[PDB]
A paper describes a structure:
The sigma-1 receptor (σ1R) is a non-opioid transmembrane receptor which has been implicated in many diseases, including neurodegenerative disorders and cancer. The sigma-1 receptor (σ1R) is a small, unique integral membrane receptor that is localized primarily in the endoplasmic reticulum (ER). σ1R responds to a structurally diverse array of synthetic ligands such as (+)-pentazocine (agonist) and haloperidol (antagonist). Published structures of human σ1R reveal its homotrimeric organization of a cupin-fold β-barrel body that contains the ligand binding site, a carboxy-terminal V-shaped two-helix bundle, and a single amino-terminal transmembrane helix, while simulation studies have suggested a ligand entry pathway that is generated by conformational rearrangements of the cupin-fold domain. Here, we present multiple crystal structures, including an open-like conformation, of σ1R from Xenopus laevis.
To further validate the structural integrity of the cysteine mutants of xlσ1R, we solved a structure for the xlσ1R-C179/C203 double mutant (xlσ1RC179/C203-S1RA, 3.80 Å) to ensure that the folding of xlσ1R was not disrupted by the cysteine mutation(s). The same homotrimeric organization was observed in xlσ1RC179/C203-S1RA, which resembles closely other xlσ1R structures. The α4/α5 region of xlσ1RC179/C203-S1RA appeared also similar to the closed and the open-like conformations. The xlσ1RC179/C203-S1RA crystals were grown in the presence of PRE084, and S1RA was later soaked in after the crystals had formed. As expected, no disulfide bond was formed between Cys179 and Cys203 in this structure, thus allowing S1RA access to and binding in the ligand-binding site. This result indicates that substitution of the residues 179 and 203 with cysteine did not perturb the structural integrity of xlσ1R, and the resulting xlσ1R mutants retained the ligand-binding activity. However, interestingly, in one of the 24 protomers of the xlσ1RC179/C203-S1RA structure, an extra electron density resembling the shape of S1RA was observed near the ligand entrance in addition to the S1RA molecule in the ligand-binding site.
Author numbering:
A (entry chain E): 12 to 217
B (entry chain A): 5 to 217
C (entry chain C): 4 to 217
The structure:
């Protein structure tokens, strides 16, 4: 099993290393930084329009968009899932309250471009934290674990790469053992299923 | 489409119709406006004096329904990522009245349950973030917030927030959320014992009052 | 009055507690809360990085063979009771532990109710403590020393730069259940759990090796 799971990780990491992707972290970061310094609602709408223009058939429609609460690692915010597959996902994340906690250690590289508010990150193994402002882009690398903190008006555009199904375990831990808000769990499963079916339908049409 | 699960769906539906029918026709003791007004009368005063005056008024207008001072104690409450303390004045299978608040800065998930809850802030601040929005509102002493049935919001409190809270609905379902952090995070089973203790005392007081009538 | 196994299990657990509590009175610990408190208060009001180094040097001087070496030191995240910080474990046994705790973010939550008396001397930042059964909290500043007694439960809150020297006495294995609750049911950071078990095992083996050499 030692060589078994090692070869399995060789196969999975080889697929992630050779898989023609749709998005890239630089693309979403530039598109978000162009609209940084504006109202986060205007930035959200313009970014959604640009994403559907440059990537048709990959972003959910306005009818299928909804703010879903996200409780994880001790912080609470809300997300609007724009795209999601087995290796990529794009969403609009943020909170209207002061929260913070564990960022989560998962098999996925995540990039967050702050549109408004503040982002305090406390990296592992240090005794000092850094504060990031609108326009900045933060890269949560694979296997990294940090402490995150957000202000009462933080909103950002987030893109994640890697083995996405592994990350959902962390995204639903507090919803199971703390909030017990199973309706929010249903909303998350619903919008994720819609994004997966949209990506599957787009693959079928091609 | 026919299956035994269709009967389970209709069975839960008729079970809900029966339970919601009981909740819709059950002569209650308190009402949210009564508790809200009594708490708003004492807003702008020292919250300890307000607590005492509210307890005296509740025991005057509703004898045999509020616990005595011997059975009152501040119990910590950890739920949804926030932490506060409660003083349970009355509790039944459909209603409960308590004095809630925190002396530290906490916040998190308000909880989605089968109960309508009303909180009248005596002192401090209350930040509420409703579901599906991108902006939150801040409520000040005197305000009254109604957390409706099935609603889920994000709450945040200051380092000196204190309020009088009244809840209506299917109370036993809500206790699962009130003890989640106490089981999987704090593991402070002594606080769990205190919560079960004051809950049992309030239920037995209400049962004894019904027996005397 | 047919207690049967019930009246005996109650008395059995009572005898076990008297056995353990007698052992804690006859264990003749190495450190004491006043010793660690003074050593931390001497360097309060200075940079917490400099204070950490001087306290580690003083601890290794006055108690050789009881503090981990620099090779075995690493900052490990600590998630418990709803708050998140970091620790640097200097010494740990079955009845004592010494570490440098603190956080660089604003956190707070349940202090945890366990079978151990804990003393924290703040080097920098602020410490808000909310005792059970009260409606007001107190704020402690660098130089102060807070004693979380056995069986006590308070609400803790720390600022974005709070750092302290902490010493714990009592039945240490019971406390690890609370220290790893959020890491299991909230963070799911199994690598941090591995780090915690790693540094804890190193401290236990160091103390065992020092006892064997004596
Ligand atoms: C995996 C995951 C982590 C997370 O946390 C908030 C994002 N950021 C994380 C790091 O920095 C702070 C905020 N949400 N989320 C998620 C939740 C639900 C999802 C549903 C479908 C697809 C991806 C889905 C992804
Ligand atoms: C069900 C429940 C929710 C809760 O949360 C704090 C209240 N508020 C909620 C919304 O707004 C913020 C604060 N406590 N609680 C509870 C806990 C223990 C109880 C024991 C006996 C009777 C009712 C008992 C009720
Ligand atoms: C049991 C425990 C609680 C805790 O919390 C931080 C300490 N303080 C608590 C009260 O005041 C605020 C901070 N860490 N910790 C721990 C974690 C890992 C340990 C490993 C080995 C030995 C003791 C070990 C002890």
């Amino acid at each position: 099993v030692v060589a078994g799971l090692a070869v399995l990780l060789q196969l999975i990491r080889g697929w992630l290393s050779s898989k023609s992707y749709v998005f890239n972290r630089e693309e979403i970061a530039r598109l978000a930084k162009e609209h940084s310094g504006l109202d986060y609602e205007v930035a959200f709408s313009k970014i959604i329009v640009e994403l559907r223009k440059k990537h048709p058939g990959h972003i959910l429609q306005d009818e299928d968009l909804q703010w879903v609460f996200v409780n994880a690692g001790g912080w609470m915010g809300s997300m609007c899932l724009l795209h999601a597959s087995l290796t990529e996902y794009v969403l609009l994340f943020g909170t209207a309250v002061d929260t913070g906690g564990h960022s989560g250690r998962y098999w996925a590289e995540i990039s967050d471009t702050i549109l408004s508010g503040t982002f305090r990150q406390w990296k592992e193994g240090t005794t000092k934290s850094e504060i990031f402002y609108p326009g900045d882009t933060i890269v949560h690398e694979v296997g990294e674990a940090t402490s995150v903190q957000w202000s009462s008006g933080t909103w950002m555009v987030e893109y994640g790469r890697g083995f996405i199904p592994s990350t959902c375990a962390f995204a639903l831990a507090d919803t199971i053992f703390s909030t017990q808000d199973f309706l929010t769990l249903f909303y998350t499963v619903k919008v994720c299923s819609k994004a997966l079916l949209l990506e599957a339908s787009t693959h079928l049409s091609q």
